[PDB]
Swiss-Prot record:
Involved in pre-mRNA splicing as component of the spliceosome. Component of the PRP19-CDC5L complex that forms an integral part of the spliceosome and is required for activating pre-mRNA splicing. As a component of the minor spliceosome, involved in the splicing of U12-type introns in pre-mRNAs. This is Pleiotropic regulator 1. GO terms for cellular component: catalytic step 2 spliceosome; fibrillar center; nuclear membrane; nuclear speck; nucleoplasm; nucleus; Prp19 complex; spliceosomal complex. WD repeats lie at residues 14-53, 56-95, 98-131, 134-169, 172-212, 213-251, 253-283. Its main location: nucleus. It comes from Homo sapiens. The gene is PLRG1. The chain holds residues 189 to 492 of 514 of the full protein. The lineage of its organism: Eukaryota, Metazoa, Chordata, Craniata, Vertebrata.
Length: 283
């Protein structure tokens, strides 16, 4: 196979701190970011220009997602808070209390109206818009699914857990896992580590292959339907891979905290520690 390499096309500034999270709204008209400057910002995707900015977290913003079935935006931050924003009204409308520590990330179930959070308190929690216990350290990322097992978490205990109980726990990683990605066809997924990015088959989590080579602190993993997998790390390096073969076909304060494709999958957006969002397309 063959993927054209990606190039830098835009740099969007405006935050005043590390950009930790990024998400694209389902209509592909705007995207939303969160930063250590404690603000949530919404930008038009075509112009890159700032549309709106929301405040309400008192700590770093670590997770964002725009609902696929609502007019709502959800967010979780290091202040242990998890909020429901109505940007049509541009304000918080609900709180989700229950985590005992900083909340690192979230994902939405495709059609059950549930929100899933992952926190430093080593648990994931489900929220109607349960408590998933068993991990022995911070859960850095969580992915939600349609079929069983619907919940996938990556923890600082180096383990993957397929879930209000765990079905599968996979211990193959030698370092703590910090990023997990689902493949849009939902038969395979991948887990990020400093030692290796590992590929697993749903639903029981069967190890497929090791994707070696990205020797850094992997903060983010994202893939599009064409099979282009993206890994961003705290040193600012980014490794592009072919999903099926596992080939690393391109290698491009500094650091990458979140990456996100747009709905067209022709744009790749990065949340970086230099306080900017960088947009890449294919050359
Ligand atoms: Ni409250």
């Amino acid at each position: 196979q063959w993927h054209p390499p990606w190039k830098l096309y835009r740099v969007i500034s405006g935050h005043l701190g590390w950009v930790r999270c990024i998400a694209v709204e389902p209509g592909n008209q705007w995207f939303v970011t969160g930063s250590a400057d404690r603000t949530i910002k919404i930008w038009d995707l075509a112009s890159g220009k700032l549309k709106l900015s929301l405040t309400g977290h008192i700590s770093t913003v670590r997770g964002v997602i725009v609902s696929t079935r609502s007019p709502y935006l959800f967010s979780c931050g290091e202040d242990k808070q998890v909020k429901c924003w109505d940007l049509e009204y541009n304000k918080v409308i609900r709180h989700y209390h229950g985590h005992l520590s900083a909340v690192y990330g979230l994902d939405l179930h495709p059609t059950i109206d549930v929100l899933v959070t992952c926190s430093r308190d080593s648990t994931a929690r489900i929220w109607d818009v349960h408590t998933l216990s068993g991990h022995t350290n911070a859960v850095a990322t969580v992915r939600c699914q349609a079929a069983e097992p619907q919940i996938i978490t990556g923890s600082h205990d180096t383990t993957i857990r397929l879930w209000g109980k765990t079905r599968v726990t996979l211990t193959n990683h030698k370092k703590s896992v910090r990023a997990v990605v689902l493949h849009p066809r939902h038969y395979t997924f991948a887990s990020g580590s400093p030692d290796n990015i590992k590929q697993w088959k749903f639903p029981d989590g069967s190890f497929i292959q090791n994707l070696s080579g990205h020797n850094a602190i992997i903060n983010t993993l994202t893939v599009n339907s064409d099979g282009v997998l993206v890994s961003g790390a705290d040193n600012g390096t980014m490794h592009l891979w072919d999903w099926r073969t596992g080939y690393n076909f391109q290698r491009v304060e500094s650091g990458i905290f979140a990456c996100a494709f747009d709905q067209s999958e022709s744009r790749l957006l990065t949340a970086e520690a230099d306080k900017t969002i960088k947009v890449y397309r294919e050359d």
